[PDB]
Design a protein around this nucleic acid. Sequence first.
RNA 1: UUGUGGUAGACGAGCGUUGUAUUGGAGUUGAAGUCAAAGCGUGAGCAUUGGUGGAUCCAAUACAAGUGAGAAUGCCGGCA
RNA 2: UUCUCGCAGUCAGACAGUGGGGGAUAAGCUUCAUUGUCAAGAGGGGAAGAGCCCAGAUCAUUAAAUAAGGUCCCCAAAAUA
RNA 3: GCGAAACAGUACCGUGAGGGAAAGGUGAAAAGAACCCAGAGAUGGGAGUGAAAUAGAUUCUGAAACCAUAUGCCUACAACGUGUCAGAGCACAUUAAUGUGUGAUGGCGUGCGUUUUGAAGUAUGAGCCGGCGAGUUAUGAUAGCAAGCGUUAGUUAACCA
Lengths: 56, 158, 99, 49, 139, 114, 144
Amino acid sequence: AVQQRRSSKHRRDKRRSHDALTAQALSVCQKCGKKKLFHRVCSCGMYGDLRVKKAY
Amino acid sequence: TKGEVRGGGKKPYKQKHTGKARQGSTRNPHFVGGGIVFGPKPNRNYSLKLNKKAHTAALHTVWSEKLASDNTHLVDQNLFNKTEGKTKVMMQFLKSAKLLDKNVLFVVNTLNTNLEQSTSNIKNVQVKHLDKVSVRDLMLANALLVEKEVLKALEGKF
Amino acid sequence: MHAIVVCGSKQYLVHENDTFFVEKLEAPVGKEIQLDKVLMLDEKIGAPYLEKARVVCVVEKHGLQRKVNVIKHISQKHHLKKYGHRQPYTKLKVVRFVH
Amino acid sequence: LNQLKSVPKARNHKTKTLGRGHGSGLGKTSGRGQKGQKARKSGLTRPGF
Amino acid sequence: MIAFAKQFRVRISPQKARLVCQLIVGKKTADAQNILSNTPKKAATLIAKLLNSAIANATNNHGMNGDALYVFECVANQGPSMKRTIPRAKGSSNMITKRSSNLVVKLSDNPNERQELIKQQKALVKKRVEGQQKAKMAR
Amino acid sequence: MRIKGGKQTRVRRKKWLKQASGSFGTRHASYKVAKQTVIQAAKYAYRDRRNKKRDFRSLWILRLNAALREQGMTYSVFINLLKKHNIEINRKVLSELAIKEPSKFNLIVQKVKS
Amino acid sequence: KTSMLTKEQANKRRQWYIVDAAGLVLGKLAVKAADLIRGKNKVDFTPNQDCGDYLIIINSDQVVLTGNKKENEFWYHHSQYIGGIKKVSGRDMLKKQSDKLVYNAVKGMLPDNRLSRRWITKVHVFKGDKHNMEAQKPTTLNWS
RNA sequence: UUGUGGUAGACGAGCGUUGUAUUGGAGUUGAAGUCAAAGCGUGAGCAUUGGUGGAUCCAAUACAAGUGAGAAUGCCGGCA
RNA sequence: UUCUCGCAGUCAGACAGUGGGGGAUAAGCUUCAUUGUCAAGAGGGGAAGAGCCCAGAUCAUUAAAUAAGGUCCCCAAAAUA
RNA sequence: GCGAAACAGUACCGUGAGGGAAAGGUGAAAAGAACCCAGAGAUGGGAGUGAAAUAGAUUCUGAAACCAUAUGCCUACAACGUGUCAGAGCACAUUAAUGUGUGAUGGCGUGCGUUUUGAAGUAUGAGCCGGCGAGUUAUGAUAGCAAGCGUUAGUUAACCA
């Protein structure tokens, strides 16, 4: 469907206002020097302290 | 004008099924493509009729103003000589005659070469002959050095 | 204590130590004017108009009213007549009294 | 009366331009009503009509 | 305290860049670098590299604290986008645009560095008021 | 003789823009719509220069009549009392301000007694 | 040029009052409540400076109505649905809510204004005389 | 004294812009154009200030106007 | 309002009354003569408004006295019998 | 302004006759941002150059509309072309000016043309900004105003200097 008139910028910004993005959850990774996002693996490839997979 | 510009007369749009203006031409004077019918027209006369009686009356009045202006002191034929084209001595003369800022006009009927080689380097001075002097040129100067032979001829001319 | 004066067609209740604007009454700046078309100064009133009652006032400036832009128009009929309005007035204040 | 001062004696009378201006007439109707045949280009039919 | 880092024409829509960077404006870099290295956004690496270059310039080229720096303001400017024609059904076409962006972010050290802008604006309007006053000082 | 002629039009449009300010967003930056809103505001101003002048009278009359009926006598009978005896010309606003300066309306209400 | 009118700003005061409804009839009590709340009884009335006070109306149920009116004129309330008109009579409202009836009457009697909604809730109306609203030290202003 | 609504429509009186003729002025101490400001104007308009700007412009009188912009489902460029 | 000269627009009108033509002495119907209005001119009363009633405006003024109309409250003005 | 200030009738369009655009500007002299830092690099930042780097090759300039963010204020029970006049509250202090900036609330307030009997309209037109955009001239005539001449005036056309 098509509106008979152009949409006001105020509904543009007000409707887009719901698109605010939440922040990421983080953790504390001690042996690897990383501030790792929660319940994931760190840049060292250690998830909960295990060198499960090689760094490179 | 419309037909003076190059371009084939045809409708780029179909007359129906188009929401824009009619636009029944590729080029249209409301475009930038041309077709202007209101511009410079090279057909005017650039002339206006003026009778000789009124013109002669205007000349009589302007020469009356000149003689009454009093800043029309007389000169002689012999004084037009004594120089080849040396304006510097003539410049000293004219500043000694308190003319530097206002235009200076010379009247002549003998066409002396000494004056014409001079007074032809500065916009503040120019010579002109009685047959070719016009009312504007007379009042363009406000400062004239008049010769002695124009007097009787001008009086007899009326 | 106070007075009521009539300037133009408007009444003004003025006490002491009060400054105010009124209509232009052809008064030079810094001069003293006795005002007579007054009413109800202090237990003093006359029936049609108050008699033998005045009030001193001192003018301090002449001014012009705020320039309003009166653009009176008839729409769809091309009427668009425009004018700018400033109205003269005098700012003045009373001094002590006079009766 | 010089080039620095030139004023005529009662000339430059009332002119009329019908293409511009709207606060003093001479706009779209241009002082000749509306919907006349003469409003179309090249009106003013032959005087013998 | 400018600490800016201009980018000048990487091809990305600033509409999404503003939306992703409200979450980092006014906050430090230590708590932001980790999250930007982890956020699932296209401009994450771009903004991370830009802020790293800005920090390097601030520390080396000028010399400041680093422990109290934080993003002063977001801005993702709209430069010249590029227009390309796309064909469609029934021999029709549309004229779509691909957006670019200028990225520049200043870094501030104190809880201040905003008010002096108003102070200097007031100064430049004052010098105007003395300029106007001097106009009537002619005798 | 071709003249670009662009500065005068932009100056006139700047003046039109400066006619009003602080409007509802797009209105204070839309030239034609701003002009129309300015015209509507001028109509408001003229119509109001009529209405407020006619309505101050009603406001004063009401605010007096409230007290007068709280004093026991209506506004119209008060006007008649003025008319029939001791006709004192006074503004309804000034009778208001007489209340704002207390201990003086008592002189009026004792003077109205014929 | 200047005779500027003076009205108080940011100055407000609201008192508690007591009014009866035994001999009263809806119209006169309604107009008196309306011009009391609405400020038509203050020498210093200001349209935007809290012209209203607090009112308490007691024993509304014994109000007298002129006979068949109680079943002649009907009070309707329409819901969001078709046939949503619920229609009641005077005898029904007299035992269920006449305080709401006088509420409706005075709200339709008051100007439909942004402040009038705050004006209309300034009055506490009860069919009895034993409740919490009597602990605010009210004033016996009846027939007012 | 009479007024002073006013369509189309008639009249009268005006303002502004470009440039030519001249007088005159101003001009890196900063022209034009520019934005910004809390003026003067009965109106077409006229200032002032401060910063950008980097080199002509304006005051007065006439003359000739590609001489006066909101609409033309107008045209172009950019922007939604 | 008569005379001359210049410039035109105007012949797609509408409403109401008074009296008529048609029709159903029907229609906010059509066409008419007169009266006024709107077009071309706004306000106040009619809750709303081109034609209805009172009306016929340079502008401004925190003034008064009135017309139609109105005076239980909305919404400004009164009561007495 | 020749369509064309440039490798212009060019690119491009059709298969072909034919149709047919756009875009110029560095600084004084490039001395064109050498050297360092970050990054893969572009690039950015320093530093340097230079009178100036709001002179950085993105280049004479840089309004509007368009998109943002922030100074001070208001706003999440409210029937509004969102404004006027009153109006606190707040934050200030000017082209010293009956000061400015925002406006809780009160009173009231159904666009601009267009053609039209008559449109606030659900008739049409407009997304916005900028630019551009439509009563000239020739030969005469009519009438007015003004000027000149003047009652055997006056005018010269073409034409020559």
